[PDB]
C-alpha cells in the first residue's frame, strides 16, 4: 500500500497490520452517501449537554465534502471507509454521533465524533503539528480526516516506539493522496 | 520572594476537552498569542534563584477559590494538576503542555472527592464548602511555587491566580 518517505524508516507497525485487514481500495460506495453512512445524528461527548442544530448542519456539510473528496481521491481512505462500512456503518444503528462545534475528538476506548470549524476562526489561536518544515497549523481537512480515521480504525495515537502512531500516518498518506499540500506530520507531540 | 505571572493564559478561544482521542494534546495559549506567534502561560520568580517545585491546579473563578472539578492534563500532570521541578538555573518558567479536561456533569461529586483525597486544595477550603453549584464554564490557574530557604528546606511561596479561562 502506498506510504510516505517520512514513514518508511520506522513506519508505524499498527497501521501496517490494520492494512492486513482493510484491503478493499475499490470505489464501490457512492461518495455523496458517506456522511449518512458515518453519522446518525447530533450528539456530544457529554450526554447531558446538547448540540446546536445549526452548527450541526454547518459541520455536516463540510464533513460531507471532505468525505466525498477523500473517497474519490484516496485509495488508502477507500480502504478504511470500505472496511468500516462492512463491519458497522452499513447498520443504521451502528453510526456515530456528530458532536458539531465541540473540541476535536472521537470515542475509541455511545460513539461520538466531535468536529468544529474553529480552524477558520480568528478568535481561536491556531494549533500546530510538527513537520520537517517547522510547525504547521492544523487545517480543517487534516483535523476532520484525523478524527474520522480514529472512527474508521478504532485505533489510538499512542503507539509504543513510534513517534506518530497509526492515525497520524494514515492521515498523512490520505492527505497526500488528496493533493493536500501541507507537509506530513512527523511526530504526534512536539520536541 | 514572590511569583509573578508575566504571560497570562488567554481567556477565550480554547475549548475544554473530554476523554477521547483528539488530534493533539492541546496547550493553553498565552494572552499575547496571535496567528503568527502562539505564546504559553509563563511565570517569573522574583527574589529567589535555585531548585524548586511548581504545582499548577484549577480553582473556581470566584472566592472562596475551591479546587475545580475539572482536570489539568498533559505532560507532568497527575490527578488533575501539573507538578514538575523548576529549571534550577532560570527565574522564568513557561508551561507549554497544559490542557483542561472537563468532567461530565454526572461525575462532579466524584471529581470533588478526588480533589480532597489528593490534597489538591491551594487555599485549604473546608470540605463543608466544597458542595453546591460549580461554574463548569470557567476556571483559574493557581500557581503554587515551592522554593528553598537558606538551609535548603522547602519554602512555599504565596499562591498566585491567573485570569479566568472560559470554555463557552
Ligand atoms: Cl499548538
Ligand atoms: Cl494528523
Author numbering:
A (entry chain B): 28 to 136, 146 to 227
B (entry chain A): 19 to 186
Article excerpt on this structure:
Here, we report that the zinc metalloprotease T3SS effector proteins GtgA, GogA, and PipA from S. enterica cleave a subset of NF-κB subunits comprising p65, RelB, and cRel, whereas NleC from EPEC/EHEC cleaves all five NF-κB subunits. GtgA, in both its apo-form and in complex with p65, has a globular structure, with the catalytic core assuming a Zincin-like fold. Similar to NleC, the active-site cleft of GtgA is highly negatively charged, and the active-site cleft mimics the shape of the DNA major groove.
To prevent cleavage of p65 by GtgA during crystallization, GtgA was inactivated by mutating the glutamate residue in the HEXXH motif to a glutamine (E183Q). GtgA(20–228)E183Q–p65(20–188) crystals belong to space group P212121 with a single heterodimer in the asymmetric unit (a.u.). Residues 20–27 and 137–145 and the C-terminal residue Asn-228 are not visible in the electron density of GtgA(20–228)E183Q nor are the two C-terminal residues of p65(20–188) (residues Arg-187 and Ala-188). GtgA interacts with the p65 NTD via a large interface with a buried surface area of 1081 Å2. Most of the residues in p65 that interact with GtgA, including the p65 cleavage site, are in the loop connecting strands β1′ and β2′, with secondary binding interactions represented by the positively charged surface of the loop connecting strand β7′ and helix αA′ in p65 and the negatively charged surface of the loop connecting helices αC and αD in GtgA. Despite the absence of the active-site zinc atom in the complex structure of GtgA–p65, the carbonyl oxygen of the P1 residue Gly-40 is positioned above the zinc-coordinating site, hydrogen-bonded with GtgA His-182 and Asp-193. The P1′ residue Arg-41 inserts into the negatively charged S1′ pocket formed by the N-terminal portion of the upper rim and the right wall of the active-site cleft. The side chain of p65 Arg-41 is sandwiched by hydrophobic contacts in between the aromatic rings of Phe-131 and Phe-174, with its guanidino group directly hydrogen-bonded to the side chains of GtgA Asp-155, Glu-163, and Ser-179. Within the active-site cleft of GtgA, the backbone of p65 Glu-39 is hydrogen-bonded to the backbone of Thr-133 of GtgA, whereas its side chain forms hydrogen bonds with the side chains of GtgA residues Gln-192 and Asp-193.
